Symmetry: D3
Subunit: 260 residues, 6 copies
């Protein structure tokens, strides 16, 4: 029923499995359109819990935002109706829990996507990287905020400023992951927890989830502060460095950033 | 001088011990009113630190809200002057440190109560559960907010959406607990910390505790957002699921939740 | 060049070494003025990352706020223009990452200073304490807020109410520190990470740092609540206890606090 | 095409005329559902400006909330999905200007409804009253806020505390109305302005309307404050006085309020 | 029963008449303490509306803050527990409408006091001046906020930057006053309105006043911004100019301000 | 001296007169850069009050934003460092009162500019229009906020949705202006007020001006609401209507807006 995802229903749990292996489940507009369609189709009282996953044995869970779909320069790369912006809002507003079940490496926007979900259960061999400083991308306020609700600020700044992968074991220690399991146990450990959640009161889960969403968003600022940040972001997406970051990825080389 | 608590004073440290074991120290109106009177009576310059505890050897620290006293009549069960709501505000505004010293199992409202205190020191055998999804209860914004200042969002959502107990060891790992001690060392570990705090400057403690309280509360939202959440909560406490949750608990059977 | 700091530039990384061992790198105005000038002078495109350190082998990283300079004539000791308040603003607003590379003991205002920095890498023998309750100091809102973005509320309250030192191992476990290494590896580990950061896109680093700063600050309150807190702080810095704390420190004796 | 409104379209201007004169255009659920359906049907690119009006010659523009549909005792009479609450939100979110063109007397909820619209043009004989204090109604935060964006606090508190009618001339003087015109010129004057607005850029109008909506709503408070206000409101809608106010209106007698 | 006020109650209305004309009803601690005790004594269910007035034929309604009680030698003149700050909070939180019935001239803190009240009815010969720039006083955030809810910013800035008296006619036109009437009608007009308000639902009045109070207060800012403003205010109350403003007032001469 | 403004000092008052009559004082980058330099040059203790004026006899006070300098499409026209955005911040943060003394017609950005000033004194023949809906411009949040602190919402929505001029008399009536005077009296009346202000306490004026600025900006919102607004603004500046509005102005014809 979808080109880019496969949905299986097990009792009251729906498992949405990525089927975009040819672009390593990059969050291209058409992939995200199918994932959002599949979530919408599952917004029914007989479904009580969602699992997001890559196919069994995947080396790459998701390669993150489709770098080819980023603008060439002079345009905001992460505007409100960008597909990554759409899917994080939809996950956060969805009235059922969404568990990210992670096998393989997770990159950039895909790391934000799983951080926006309710629980993360990961393989012992999974790895996690936050990548805008590799490309010169001015990440947006909402996107950064979605990275700050689990690990502390020092941990988050190390992840973003180094863009270095962290292990599942370190991700568990700093509070990013709920559980780390051997890859052979991942699917059944995650399904056991999803089935348990599915026996609980779904209207209580939905309103508690919404209350947590609203409290998590409730860091408020005045208009001048937001427009000041937007002007800083524009200077970045106008920079030579942003174009060097895009070109280095296209030419498969290490970018040379100079600070303009 | 109280029916439902025993108070011992050791120089500048006051220990408030639950005396409601008949009802597993459930947070009934008469128990909370005594606990609040005892705290009020200890608000004197000669007292510098409070310890809350269950009696030595308790299997159950507190069974949480008295489910007989939960409003069933399409009436908000966690309104501003509900005893649980009163005691958390009082604990948080109290100008001395309050340490929860936990032996036995902690449930629901009693988990929110210890989370509202300043430090938690627990026995290695103690266990912790947050239970509103078991009953279909739409936990209130302030109450949920009180669960979000220690562990991360993914961890909080696991605790609430599963309603599964966690060990003291996991509660320490995720940042809920300050210390975990062998049961036979719990009382003297907690007392030595309370005596030590009692040597420090009480006016500096009080103003710093109050500054943390107001920074912790300073997640702000507009009226529309609050009224929208209140409407969602009312749809939950009006639901058939909420009735089924209450009735199943009291009739000692598994509830059948349907999403209405 | 600078009287009170030494700067070594290695490729794109600047290492700022404290040179105030006379007062164990206490935050005297003359020392902070030199540190802020040295930071300002490093705000140039060819510098990509800063390390702050005490001299190799230091027993004391920083002894904290200069207690001789703390106002005890009954004015606010932590007003907006105080050296500690100035250096934390400058570190947070600095468009390059600032890593605190810690060897030795860290006290009070120096603990707030490293908490305000982006990443903290510490020696396994380093120790950390937050000390206002030893002196009767009413720590200000911004300074307390700077302590709340890494460890949870319960842990922060234990640190502040006890003013007890914690080990590097505990500071890592509770999420204050990024990494703990053997002293012999501290320069190698820290420089490797700083050089790595220095290959990344500096304009993306700067805007994301600023986004995190403004999100971190975005706990808002009304004027009445601020003026109320300021009145409570005044009552503390006018107290007999505050004079007793200051005198006790200068006379190298134990303060006796009485709650006025 | 509607039972309770009549819609006329003149180029880019739509006039929605009430057709509920046998209940004096009271804001009953059936009337408001037709009004909201008519607005939704007009959310089309070629419609640029809406006028809301009562029929020509109306003595009563609207008698406000249907007092027979106000919750009798114990339920919030002004919950998020109450019809008055739904229509003010829809008017304010609607991406085209909505002009209230007022002939006759305006009461209670209907006064809040025209205040929620973008412009008010009124007959010289029109009158305005805000009536919750006649009935003992605890008007909700969003609804009170909707009355505060035109005239000052003192003038708003006079209107609500007295429940006395003001003339169109006073309503113009204090900043509630845009224009006052003789009743024979009201339709022509309002249509000329609507046609003129309709020549302007609709996407600029829509985004500026939405910017004003969000700035108007951006009075934020913490969860405890909202829950405290909700507890005060519940005490009022649980009061003897609230029952007495409803009873007195329906028995056409002077209420006897006693402050419980 | 009071030295500095006279209270008369008829039916459900109380009139608090100032009795401190030998000091032109200056807001000395002893006068504010009596006014607050009189209002506290009237917080009874049978009292439903308060009027504040000067005696019949007063030239000076209130000469404002007693300049003799303004702190010199570097304390904040408008700290949270200053009598003017206490009375404005008490009026705003008082669960009954408070009408200011004004005959004569209104100065400085007394202008803030009447602005904090619910309605102002004034004689046609009344005059109003806001005076901090006369004395070099850094008016506090709450106090300035209390002046912004009636007239627009440009008008408020004219009143403050000029310190020039405005007529009752102009005060009515700009939205500061509810009504202006000839002196001989002032008491009859105000009593008619107070007695009319006292027949309305008191619990509805109280909750709506409190909702307006919290919405009015709900302009929120971060800790840094409040601390930055406080540093600015301290520099002013530490200034040459502030000492010169007070000295000039008490020596009955014109200050020479120099901007230090 | 300046190419595009003329500055006169009279005692402690500085008058900045526009000298760009060949472009009807349009807010070009070269003009704004000169006005800002002149303002910065006058930030001196011997200057107490600023007046902004057009030359005596001007038909046009300012034609507003230089339409030639708006970016053609796909670019935000009112970014943080746009000249209009810069000048309004600088006027608002300027520690001396700035009085707009208006002869002639005021358009668009020039209307936002005088609104951002402290007081407006205008000739009886002056006229005022706010014009973004003539051109299809998505005005920014800060810009709109600057139009909301004087007149009420219904009045501001009329001015913006119609783009029709208002007279000085109506602008006085709705709270936009301080004073309207005959053109022959304008200069003398404005100078007398400016000289009067110049004898008051400048430090008190500066801190109260800054308090008002921050209270004025203190309408706060979460990141998502800001980014949702920016997405809407970008849909407008990407629109065919935006291109049509600019092309119509250039080609001197009536635009044909279609809603995309
Ligand atoms: C902008 C935001 C964002 O999400 N950016 C994307 C962040 N993602 C990344 O940085 C991952 C970039 N890719 C990689 O590091 C490697 O391709 C990955 C994931 C490790 C796996 O390496 P492999 O050697 O197995 O495969 P290989 O290098 O040959 O690539 C296979 C084909 O897929 C392509 N590819 C990979 N990632 C992306 C992507 N994110 N967007 C678009 N295309 C992608 C890659 O270029 C290659 O294409 P072909 O050469 O045409 O076959 S931000 O950075 O968070 O701000
Ligand atoms: C509503 C909020 C809240 O705090 N709800 C309450 C959450 N509390 C719980 O879920 C704990 C429920 N109870 C249990 O799990 C077990 O009773 C525990 C506490 C482990 C005790 O086990 P035991 O085997 O020793 O005793 P047993 O199950 O036989 O129960 C003995 C009698 O105590 C009763 N009881 C227990 N808890 C409560 C309660 N919270 N309110 C009212 N009654 C309670 C239980 O019904 C039984 O009563 P009898 O039938 O008279 O023997 S919320 O959920 O957080 O939103
Ligand atoms: C107010 C905020 C704050 O930052 N308070 C300060 C917190 N700092 C402290 O508690 C550390 C106090 N210092 C010490 O305990 C000792 O100096 C420690 C670190 C244990 C090291 O002992 P030593 O015997 O090795 O060194 P010694 O005591 O002789 O000091 C060397 C010279 O520097 C001086 N010194 C030290 N600390 C400070 C300080 N915080 N402020 C001002 N001066 C300090 C110390 O007095 C000595 O100077 P001389 O006696 O003149 O040689 S708050 O508390 O966070 O609110
Ligand atoms: C909850 C909010 C709200 O909007 N409350 C309702 C506010 N509306 C009012 O207070 C209007 C009350 N009614 C009146 O003042 C008069 O009925 C009105 C509008 C002036 C016109 O008087 P008339 O002489 O032409 O007709 P008359 O008074 O005899 O009543 C005709 C029949 O209609 C009825 N009626 C009127 N208004 C309402 C209403 N809002 N809800 C329900 N019924 C209403 C009135 O009771 C009478 O009924 P019958 O005697 O059976 O024919 S609140 O108050 O703002 O909080
Ligand atoms: O005497 P006041 O004018 O101060 O107030 P009060 O309500 O007693 O009397 C005025 C009469 O007019 C009525 N009124 C209320 N609101 C409106 C309105 N929006 N348009 C027209 N008339 C209005 C109000 O009901 C009152 O009439 P009665 O209740 O019959 O005494
Ligand atoms: C500090 C805040 C505040 O509320 N400041 C106070 C603002 N109040 C004023 O500026 C009013 C100052 N006073 C005057 O303008 C005149 O005294 C007024 C009130 C018009 C009355 O004129 P009169 O000719 O009838 O009486 P006269 O000028 O000779 O003074 C009578 C005696 O009372 C004294 N007086 C007056 N006002 C105050 C005051 N606010 N605090 C302390 N004393 C005051 C005045 O100095 C004179 O004193 P003696 O000659 O010693 O009997 S602030 O400025 O808003 O921030
Ligand atoms: C975008 C923001 C903004 O500030 N927009 C600009 C708003 N300003 C306007 O709409 C005013 C546009 N101009 C007019 O209304 C009239 O040109 C004005 C002030 C009344 C004077 O008309 P007159 O008949 O007296 O003289 P006339 O029109 O013949 O002289 C016109 C020459 O000057 C030019 N002009 C005028 N205004 C501007 C402007 N704002 N930017 C650029 N050029 C302008 C106009 O195009 C014409 O040029 P030439 O005749 O070709 O030399 S927004 O709209 O607030 O968002
Ligand atoms: O007259 P309306 O108010 O109904 O709108 P409309 O713009 O069509 O009519 C007025 C004419 O005056 C113009 N206008 C716009 N803003 C201003 C201003 N601040 N000062 C002077 N004139 C202004 C507006 O361009 C319109 O011009 P024309 O369409 O050429 O008649
Ligand atoms: Ni927060
Ligand atoms: Ni406001």
């Amino acid at each position: 029923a979808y080109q880019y995802v496969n949905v299986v229903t097990i009792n009251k749990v729906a498992v949405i499995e990525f089927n975009y292996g040819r672009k390593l489940n990059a969050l291209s507009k058409v992939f995200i359109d199918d994932l959002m369609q599949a979530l919408s189709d599952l917004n029914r009282p007989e479904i009580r819990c969602i699992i997001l996953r890559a196919p069994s044995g995947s080396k790459v869970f998701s390669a993150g935002h489709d770098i080819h779909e980023l603008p060439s320069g002079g345009r905001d790369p992460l505007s409100y109706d960008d597909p990554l912006r759409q899917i994080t809002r939809m996950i956060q507003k969805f009235p059922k829990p969404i568990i990210s079940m992670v096998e393989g490496s997770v990159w950039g926007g895909a790391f934000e996507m799983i951080m926006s979900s309710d629980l993360i259960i990961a393989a012992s061999t999974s790895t996690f990287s936050m990548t805008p400083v590799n490309l010169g991308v001015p990440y947006n306020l909402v996107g950064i905020h979605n990275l700050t609700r689990d690990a502390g600020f020092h941990i988050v700044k190390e992840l973003i400023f180094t863009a270095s992968p962290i292990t599942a074991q370190r991700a568990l220690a700093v509070g990013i992951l709920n559980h780390v399991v051997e890859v052979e146990e991942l699917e059944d450990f995650t399904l056991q927890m999803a089935h348990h959640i599915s026996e609980k009161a779904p209207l209580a889960i939905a309103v508690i989830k919404e209350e947590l969403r609203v409290l998590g968003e409730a860091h408020t600022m005045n208009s001048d502060e937001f427009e000041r940040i937007q002007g800083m972001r524009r200077a970045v997406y106008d920079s030579e460095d942003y174009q060097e970051g895009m070109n280095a990825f296209l030419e498969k080389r290490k970018p040379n950033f100079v600070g303009h």
